[PDB]
Design a protein around this ligand. Structure first.
Ligand code: CLA
Ligand code: CLA
Ligand code: CLA
Ligand code: CLA
Ligand code: CLA
Ligand code: CLA
Ligand SMILES: CCCCCCCCCCCCCCCCCC(=O)OC[C@H](CO[C@@H]1O[C@H](CO)[C@H](O)[C@H](O)[C@H]1O)OC(=O)CCCCCCCCCCCCCCCCC
Ligand SMILES: CCCCCCCCCCCCCCCCCC(=O)O[C@@H](COC(=O)CCCCCCCCCCCCCCC)COP(=O)(O)OC[C@H](O)CO
Ligand SMILES: CC1=C[C@H](O)CC(C)(C)[C@H]1/C=C/C(C)=C/C=C/C(C)=C/C=C/C=C(C)/C=C/C=C(C)/C=C/C1=C(C)C[C@H](O)CC1(C)C
Ligand SMILES: CC1=C(/C=C/C(C)=C/C=C/C(C)=C/C=C/C=C(C)/C=C/C=C(C)/C=C/C2=C(C)CCCC2(C)C)C(C)(C)CCC1
Ligand SMILES: CC1=C(/C=C/C(C)=C/C=C/C(C)=C/C=C/C=C(C)/C=C/C=C(C)/C=C/C2=C(C)CCCC2(C)C)C(C)(C)CCC1
Ligand code: SF4
Ligand code: SF4
Lengths: 733, 82, 193, 97, 81, 42, 153
């Protein structure tokens, strides 16, 4: 094209300002560009992936460098408690003198920010001890970023441009990624733990200098090649072991003993080494499954063809599904995002209950920030998975090649799926809201004993099945005579039971009726968001109101006011509506997590157990009570270090409320206002000299929906982050 | 009609700000109690002059501070208000 | 017919040995599927026929039962016993290795044959007494084999269920318990505790 | 145990099973399973690096046992042998019952 | 560089699509596939704004006139300035 | 009278009568059997 | 003692909650003469509270550590009256309502203007069909068996 954007001829000749907008949100959607082919699209995807890797490495290098240059890692290593981590220094010319006073924390000589990302504990656990290690790591990550950028440039040149069939070689890619990207990387991390991190935890400094001279075991690799692997699990670290020193240390490398370290309240490093070694073995085995140039292996196409149930209860089964899943990039993107979101929720739910880094369980603000961050990330990623599934249905789905498949039969019975999801969401919402309102009314009338409190008997039984003994159930892993208890009695059961039955950590917290109600509200949110996203995906190709939606693309505003009105009829609008429900669900999850943990850390779990059963308790004892120090960050009497969190709190409230006008007020009013504004500028003396090149127009309907959603999400995230960090930092527990 | 629908929100906003101003100003500078000696003690102690100039002051000293009488009304005769 | 007064399924016509028209779920609609089911059923019944004396006789001779004979592999360094005598090479790795080596290559030649009748009834070296020479007696023996094998499968279900109900004891002990006073100790006590 | 004896025995048994017992079934399954994209094989679709090495898979064995099968069945044997050795060394694990 | 207005053969012959057009995009041409012996046509889609009044008056089961929004000009964005 | 009975058969009037009768029944039940959390008759 | 819950009739915290409620009610009662209507209302409220606490204790409810009764919905036969019996009663009543509505919709389905029978309910037919939901489980089971419950479109 002759004008920005150059990838779209239709947008380039636009005389209005929306072109400037629309060249931004369509820049990375290569499939909608002008004069594109398949191989060019694949090569652009490859180059953008290399770029993204480069920015990830550069961001990590910047984190390491700023911690090394402005942080207090060396003084934090000596005293992991009673020392606050420092992320980076603060240089603000707008700062007043009391701002410089209140923000001078740690051993720093100026204003600093207190790191709540947990990178200090992670780097301390894995062997980094001094600032020169952080400088070397930052240099290595910068070199990796440069290498990835060079590779992205190289693989776009005509000599090194890959063919489209190379990208479609799914068997070799999956084999290499399972064996090399998963197995070999986990084996290398096992080697790092065994050679460096585990000796570092015992007071031995192992670097590239003494790399080849320090034996990880007294017996070397002999117990690895001649059998008798148990010689690597002879004497583990004692219960009186102190992290980072040789007092109470052992010489074991790979052990299977459950529970946490007594001092750090985190998992044993030898446990992690054995875990990553076993995972490396499993992935290296699994990476020899599919066929390659060597004749042996599986063909996933025939794997999908063969799995047809006789009787036709699944139609033609998975016939032809390999071609659709291999040819469609949006199918792969949706599956990748769904799996990534599921394991991100797994990461969030497993780091708080089974902490992985030394002295991170005591850092409550770090744990809260990490959990909230990864849960919001997982929610956004799952929403994107469903959105890209809808995109695949609109763009890449081929009905002729998918007849009587397990994929077409979803569209065959989409009404049943949508209606049953609607029933589940309606039932959950009706009964959960009714129970909550019942409890609020009963306690308002001075009768808290008339509440409906349902004990989560199922989840309590599951906790007893995992070894908890606070409910009286004599079941597996809690009864001393069970075969499950007897089989694993000698290996890991004592430590695991000691960690579970300890009522100070987050491992299998005691739950009550409030947990039941909030978990059912969580189920309501999940079911409703799934309902919206599944309805959008399955009605993306068309419905009775708009049978030809597939001809109108993924994102279009409406179909006019005819047929009763057709606002928000596209699948993009279904995604936009479901983002609100995802935000509400993650808000409920993080509210529950933060309140339960902030009552446990104070040793006042009775407040949560008695106040979480009604919504006024949530409003008063959680939102109103814990925001005193947050809103008192600055007052007429002065300010303190929580003033930044108060300012970000109000900033989030403001930008959350600003999206309400991109969401409520619509386009015609603003266009008719802009017409009068243009008339005023064209008729104002000394101002007709200055004229616009692009004609001012109102924001597009889809554009305004996106802008309002962005303001809404920014307000949600910033407000809750400010409240969470201020509440957990004004009192640490 | 949509212009009326939009202006309803702005009338709501304007009247809400007006009534918040009235409530805080009369609670801080007019309403209160008279002692037998002759001194006057107001409900909010005359904090409108120094706190209402900031949005944080409205959030803390007006919304958060005075909502304690409506969130703690459970179990009493004012629980219908909660 | 298995269930009098009930119509026969269309897949079964009564020509097969033991074809009593019992297929409520309609598993054998496809003819080659039905042939595979016939072969698999015959193998299951023959294994249970070898099982039932192999469970009853060691219990009757006072060597334990069919659950005691597997206790030694649970113990560390356990020693297997035959007729009260310990086999010198009877350790779990050696026993499992010889079982995998010899149970394979005897289940492999069985899959080499493609004739369905030979897959079910191979003959040859497996019929040394010439009982399959006369066709009428051949079908009669087919029906007898089918009926005794279904009885053996039911007996093995009884074995497993009685072991689950009464852990760590023998089926003949359960029979003696029933014969002690049949009106008081039976399935009723476990069906209503 | 003796690592050499166990490793040699397990590798020999696995190679024997691959050569004699489970050879025809495996050959038939690789005959039926060939990776194809868009109805054609990976190499003929335009991928120059997906060509099957017919020189490496050509063998003078009467049944066609080639080096790749040797590597796979030896991997099975070594894995089984090391499992046996590591389990026999440990005098624990589901033993209390 | 205009909205794409398409006429399909399911058109009855009612001129309501033409009468509902505020920019004179559609017209009625002779035909033989219906009783009315006429069908709609869109020769002036360069002046189409996209208001979709034409397909808000089409009485068929689904619309015989379809307006697909496309590249937008000064006369397609309804700009008097 | 037929028109008035038709008006009494319309949706809001009939709904009001039905829901008023139901609310009265529930209120009288709650007066005579107050503070019911379980079903203790069996 | 399911899930570590003491029975409400043997719970100290339950009696403590009753004591706080009675103390607050007596503090409210002290403002009025005993022969007045507000005093009689307060005394009736106190008697109702005492009866409620006694009934909750005698019903077999399990009280938690906070002194409030906790319902058990796992299906335990000691607590079938908390969820299962009221659940069966609710399912019966809801099936009654749904069956009556479905019968009314089916009856007015084949008319000239069926919608006129929805905005204006035909009361005699509705009252005729009201008691047909008394035997709703039998009718629904038979209709499912005869393939009349579902429509194959
Ligand atoms: C894992 C990475 C990932 C990748 C590679 C893609 C890839 C793609 N997506 Mg998906 N997507 C993802 C995750 C991902 N998505 C997630 C997590 C969500 C949920 C938030 C979505 C939701 C989504 C939507 C709603 C849409 C796409 C579409 C597209 C295209 C990008 C549009 C563009 O040009 O930039 C646009 C973005 C910007 C350059 C700036 C504007 C908005 C920013 C982010 C403001 C917020 C601050 C591209 C094919 C678009 C498409 O047209 O598909 C057919 C589109 O409509 N995606
Ligand atoms: C064995 C060699 C090998 C290796 C190492 C890789 C590696 C890679 N390839 Mg693959 N690839 C291979 C063979 C290989 N490939 C072959 C033979 C082909 C052709 C058939 C391809 C075709 C191919 C394509 C077409 C593309 C890739 C892509 C990628 C990159 C993925 C992005 C990423 O970094 O993942 C990072 C992920 C991990 C290291 C592991 C997974 C993470 C799990 C899910 C999380 C759990 C881990 C753990 C908890 C982490 C803790 C975090 C810490 C902070 C505590 C990665 C560099 C992309 C690319 O190159 O981008 C530049 C891409 O577009 N590959
Ligand atoms: C916080 C307020 C709120 C509430 C309560 C709801 C409620 C609901 N949403 Mg909505 N929604 C909201 C905000 C809200 N939404 C926002 C901000 C958005 C973003 C635009 C959406 C977008 C949205 C989508 C995209 C979808 C829903 C759907 C639903 C339903 C979910 C299932 C369920 O929970 O039903 C339980 C029902 C209730 C909680 C509401 C009724 C409240 C009580 C029970 C009323 C009983 C009446 C009472 C006697 C009063 C009498 C009235 C009068 C006489 C005075 C439900 C009707 C989903 C759906 O339709 O599911 C079927 C769905 O598809 N919502
Ligand atoms: C179907 C196959 C079958 C199998 C797998 C077994 C298996 C077993 N038998 Mg049984 N057995 C069988 C059929 C079978 N039997 C038959 C048909 C008879 C009657 C001749 C017997 C009569 C006997 C005797 C055994 C014993 C044993 C055990 C020791 C084996 C050994 O070689 O030393 C072993 C668990 C031993 C035992 O009782 O265990 C303690 C014993 O000495 N069996
Ligand atoms: C989620 C659904 C829900 C559920 C299951 C309950 C459940 C209950 N409520 Mg609650 N409630 C709710 C929502 C809900 N509520 C909401 C939203 C509000 C606010 C409007 C209230 C406010 C409330 C009050 C004010 C009261 C209750 C009470 C009751 C109890 C039954 C009342 C009664 O005595 O019935 C008796 C039995 C019947 C009416 C059955 C009728 C069957 C007919 C006669 C047919 C017979 C068949 C032939 C029971 C614990 C009462 C209580 O004391 O709780 C302990 C009570 O006083 N509730
Ligand atoms: C006549 C009775 C009636 C019956 C039998 C059904 C039946 C059904 N409904 Mg429908 N529905 C009705 C009325 C009815 N509905 C009404 C009035 C509305 C408007 C609020 C809806 C809206 C609706 C929704 C939004 C959903 C269903 C769903 C369902 C299914 C699951 C059950 C459930 O979710 O209930 C939930 C019921 C309602 C939300 C409450 C309204 C029902 C009232 C209490 C009764 C109506 C009775 C009528 C006015 C009485 C007249 C009597 C006559 C003598 C004149 C089920 C097939 C779900 C689904 O499709 O999944 C399969 C679901 O998602 N229904
Ligand atoms: C004073 C309160 C009474 C108001 C109602 C009485 C006058 C209204 C008209 C009237 O009765 O016309 C008389 C009407 C109909 O009477 C005649 O009926 C004929 C049919 O054969 C024709 O329709 C005639 O035109 C009509 O006049 O009678 C009614 O329908 C009245 C029904 C009973 C009304 C109850 C009043 C209680 C509720 C009040 C609200
Ligand atoms: C619980 C398990 C439920 C299994 C249900 C799946 C079985 C098929 C369902 C078919 C159905 O609903 O209808 C059947 C009837 O339903 C059943 O047989 C299932 C009854 C389910 C309830 C009882 C289950 C056991 C409950 C134990 C307690 C048969 O009717 P038809 O298709 O022959 O009717 C044709 C009609 O006459 C017009 O030609
Ligand atoms: C083929 C051939 C060929 C060539 O040519 C020739 C010859 C060699 C001759 C041939 C062979 C043959 C043979 C080997 C046979 C065998 C058989 C058997 C063993 C059977 C079983 C069979 C078996 C059977 C029936 C079984 C049955 C069972 C039962 C009743 C049981 C019972 C019981 C009792 C009492 C008690 C307990 O508590 C319970 C129970 C346990 C329940
Ligand atoms: C739209 C669409 C799409 C997408 C979709 C999605 C997004 C989905 C998601 C999904 C998901 C998101 C899913 C999930 C799932 C899950 C699961 C499936 C789970 C499982 C689990 C398990 C199985 C477990 C088990 C166990 C337990 C219980 C415990 C113990 C242990 C064990 C392991 C045993 C696509 C593209 C495809 C296509 C087109 C359409
Ligand atoms: C010539 C011939 C012959 C001979 C042959 C032979 C003698 C062979 C051998 C062969 C072999 C002798 C093979 C081997 C293989 C192996 C492999 C291929 C590998 C495996 C392994 C793996 C893969 C891994 C391992 C590991 C490690 C690294 C450590 C840790 C653990 C594990 C185990 C994982 C005869 C005379 C017969 C005849 C004529 C011809
Ligand atoms: S396009 Fe619409 S209005 Fe015009 S003739 Fe066809 S149906 Fe009638
Ligand atoms: S969208 Fe409007 S301007 Fe365009 S053809 Fe239809 S009626 Fe005419």
């Amino acid at each position: 094209a002759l004008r920005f954007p150059r990838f779209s001829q239709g947008l380039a000749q636009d005389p209005t300002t929306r072109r400037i907008w629309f060249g931004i949100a369509t820049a990375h959607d290569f499939e909608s560009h002008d004069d594109i082919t398949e191989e060019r699209l694949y090569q652009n995807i490859f180059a953008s992936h290399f770029g993204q890797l480069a920015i990830i490495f550069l961001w990590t290098s910047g984190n390491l460098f700023h911690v090394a240059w402005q942080g207090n890692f060396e003084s934090w290593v000596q005293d992991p408690l009673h020392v606050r981590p420092i992320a980076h220094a603060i240089w603000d010319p707008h700062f007043g003198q009391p701002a410089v006073e209140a923000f001078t924390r740690g051993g720093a000589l100026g204003p600093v920010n207190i790191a709540y990302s947990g990178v200090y504990q992670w780097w301390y656990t894995i062997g980094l001890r001094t600032n020169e290690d952080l400088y070397t790591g930052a240099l290595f990550l910068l070199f990796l970023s440069v290498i990835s950028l060079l590779g992205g440039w190289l693989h776009l040149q005509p000599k090194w441009k890959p063919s489209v069939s190379w990208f479609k070689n799914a068997e070799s890619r999956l084999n290499h990624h399972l064996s090399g990207l998963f197995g070999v990387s986990s084996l290398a991390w096992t080697g790092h733990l065994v050679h460096v991190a585990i000796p570092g935890s015992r007071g031995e400094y192992v670097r590239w200098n003494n790399f080849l001279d320090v034996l990880p075991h007294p017996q070397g690799l002999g117990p690895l090649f001649t059998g008798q692997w148990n010689l690597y699990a002879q004497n583990p670290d004692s219960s009186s072991h102190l992290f980072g020193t040789s007092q109470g240390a052992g010489t074991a490398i790979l052990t299977l003993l459950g529970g946490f370290h007594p001092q750090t309240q985190s998992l044993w490093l030898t446990d992690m080494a054995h875990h990553h070694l076993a995972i490396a073995f499993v992935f290296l085995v699994a990476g020899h499954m599919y066929r390659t140039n060597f004749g042996i292996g599986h063909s996933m196409k025939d794997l999908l063809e063969a799995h047809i149930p006789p009787g036709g209860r699944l139609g033609r089964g998975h016939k032809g599904l390999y071609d659709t899943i291999n040819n469609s990039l949006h199918f792969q993107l949706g599956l990748a995002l769904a799996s990534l979101g599921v394991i991100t929720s797994l990461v969030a739910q497993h780091m708080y209950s089974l902490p992985a880094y030394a002295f991170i369980a005591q850092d409550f603000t770090t744990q809260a920030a990490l959990y909230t961050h990864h849960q919001y990330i997982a929610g956004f990623i799952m929403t994107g998975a469903f959105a890209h599934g809808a995109i695949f249905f609109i763009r890449d789905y081929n009905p002729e090649q998918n007849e009587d498949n397990v994929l077409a039969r979803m569209l065959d019975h989409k009404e049943a799926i949508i209606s049953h999801l609607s029933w589940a969401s309606l039932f959950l919402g009706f009964h959960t809201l009714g129970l909550y309102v019942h409890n609020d009314v009963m306690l308002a009338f001075g009768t808290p004993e008339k509440q409906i409190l349902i004990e989560p008997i199922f989840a309590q039984w599951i906790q007893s099945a995992h070894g908890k003994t606070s409910y009286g159930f004599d079941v597996l892993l809690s009864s001393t005579s069970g075969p499950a208890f007897n089989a694993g009695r000698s290996i890991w059961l004592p430590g695991w039971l000691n960690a579970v039955n300890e009522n100070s950590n987050s491992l299998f917290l005691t739950i009550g009726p409030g947990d039941f109600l909030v978990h059912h509200a969580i189920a309501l949110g999940l079911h409703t968001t799934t309902l919206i996203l599944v309805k959008g995906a399955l009605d993306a190709r068309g419905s009775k109101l708009m049978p030809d939606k597939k001809d109108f693309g993924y994102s279009f505003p409406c179909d006019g006011p005819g047929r009763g009105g057709t606002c928000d009829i596209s699948a993009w609008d279904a995604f936009y509506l479901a983002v609100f429900w995802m935000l509400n669900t993650i808000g409920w999850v993080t509210f529950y997590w933060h309140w339960k943990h902030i009552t446990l850390w104070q040793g006042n779990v009775s407040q949560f157990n008695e106040s979480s059963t009604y919504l006024m308790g949530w409003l008063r004892d959680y939102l109103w009570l814990n925001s005193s120090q947050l809103i008192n960050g600055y007052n007429p009497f002065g300010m303190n270090s929580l003033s930044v969190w108060a300012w970000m709190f109000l900033f989030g409230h403001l930008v959350w409320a600003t999206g309400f006008m991109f969401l409520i007020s619509w386009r015609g009013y603003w266009q008719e206002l802009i017409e009068t504004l243009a008339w005023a500028h064209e008729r104002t003396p000394l101002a007709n000299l200055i004229r616009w090149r692009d004609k001012p127009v109102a924001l597009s309907i889809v554009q305004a929906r996106l802008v309002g959603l962005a303001h809404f999400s920014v307000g949600y995230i910033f407000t809750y982050a400010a409240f969470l960090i201020a509440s957990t930092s004004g009192k640490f527990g | 009609w949509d212009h009326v629908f939009l202006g309803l929100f702005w009338m709501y906003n304007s009247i809400s700000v007006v009534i918040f101003h009235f409530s805080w100003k009369m609670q801080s500078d007019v309403w209160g109690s008279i002692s037998d000696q002759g001194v006057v003690t107001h409900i909010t102690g005359g904090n409108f002059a120094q706190s209402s100039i900031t949005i944080n002051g409205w959030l803390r000293d007006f919304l958060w501070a005075q909502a304690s009488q409506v969130i703690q009304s459970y179990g009493s005769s004012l629980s219908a208000y909660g | 017919e298995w269930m009098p007064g009930q119509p026969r399924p269309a897949h079964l016509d009564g020509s097969a040995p033991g074809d009593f028209g019992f297929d409520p779920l309609g598993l054998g609609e496809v003819p080659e599927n039905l042939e595979r089911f016939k072969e698999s059923e015959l193998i299951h019944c023959r294994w249970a026929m070898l099982a039932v004396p192999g469970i009853l006789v060691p219990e009757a001779l006072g060597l334990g039962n069919w659950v005691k004979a597997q206790e030694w592999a649970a113990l560390p360094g356990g020693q297997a016993t035959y007729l009260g005598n310990p086999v010198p090479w009877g350790n779990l790795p050696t026993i499992l290795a010889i079982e995998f080596l010899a149970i394979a290559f005897v289940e492999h030649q069985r899959s080499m044959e493609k004739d369905s009748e030979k897959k079910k009834y191979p003959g040859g070296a497996f019929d040394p007494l010439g009982y399959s020479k006369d066709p009428k007696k051949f079908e009669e023996l087919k029906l007898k084999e089918i009926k005794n094998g279904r009885l053996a499968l039911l007996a093995f279900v009884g074995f497993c269920i009685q072991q689950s109900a009464y852990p760590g004891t023998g089926p003949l002990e359960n029979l003696a318990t029933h014969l002690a006073d049949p009106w008081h100790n039976n399935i009723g006590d476990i069906v209503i505790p | 145990l003796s690592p050499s004896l166990v490793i040699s025995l397990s590798t020999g048994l696995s190679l024997f099973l691959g050569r004699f017992v489970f050879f025809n079934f495996q050959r038939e399954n690789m005959a039926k399973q060939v990776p194809e994209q868009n109805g054609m094989s990976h190499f003929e679709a335009g991928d120059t690096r997906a060509k099957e090495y017919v020189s490496l898979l050509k063998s003078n064995d009467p049944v066609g046992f080639n080096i790749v099968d040797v590597l796979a069945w030896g991997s099975i044997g070594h894995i089984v042998a090391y499992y046996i050795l590591a389990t026999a060394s440990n005098g624990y694990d589901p033993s209390f019952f | 560089m205009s909205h794409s207005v398409k006429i399909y053969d399911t058109c009855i012959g009612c001129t309501q699509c033409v009468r509902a057009c505020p920019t004179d995009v559609l017209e009625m041409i002779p035909w033989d596939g219906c009783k009315a012996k006429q069908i709609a046509s869109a020769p002036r889609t360069e002046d189409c704004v996209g208001c979709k009044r034409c397909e808000s008056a089409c009485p068929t089961d689904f619309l015989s006139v379809r307006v697909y929004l496309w590249h937008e000009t000064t006369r397609s964005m309804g700009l008097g300035y | 009278m037929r028109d008035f009975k038709t008006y009494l058969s319309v949706a809001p009037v009939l709904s009001t009568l039905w829901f008023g009768s139901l609310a009265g029944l529930l209120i009288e039940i709650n007066r005579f059997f107050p503070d019911a959390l379980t079903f203790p008759f069996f | 003692d399911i899930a570590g819950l003491t029975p409400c009739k043997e719970s100290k915290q339950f009696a403590k909650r009753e004591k706080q409620a009675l103390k607050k009610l007596q503090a409210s009662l002290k403002l009025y003469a005993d022969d007045s209507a507000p005093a009689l209302a307060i005394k009736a409220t106190m008697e109702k509270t005492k009866k409620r606490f006694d009934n909750y204790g005698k019903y077999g409810l399990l009280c938690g550590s906070d002194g409030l009764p906790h319902l058990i919905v796992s299906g335990d036969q000691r607590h079938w009256g908390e969820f299962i019996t009221p659940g069966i009663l609710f399912l019966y009543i809801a099936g009654w309502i749904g069956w009556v509505g479905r019968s009314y919709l089916i009856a007015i389905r084949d008319e000239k203007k069926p919608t006129q029978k929805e905005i204006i309910i035909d009361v005699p037919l509705a009252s005729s069909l009201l008691f047909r939901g008394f035997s709703w489980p039998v009718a629904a089971y038979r209709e499912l068996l005869n393939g009349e419950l579902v429509d194959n479109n």
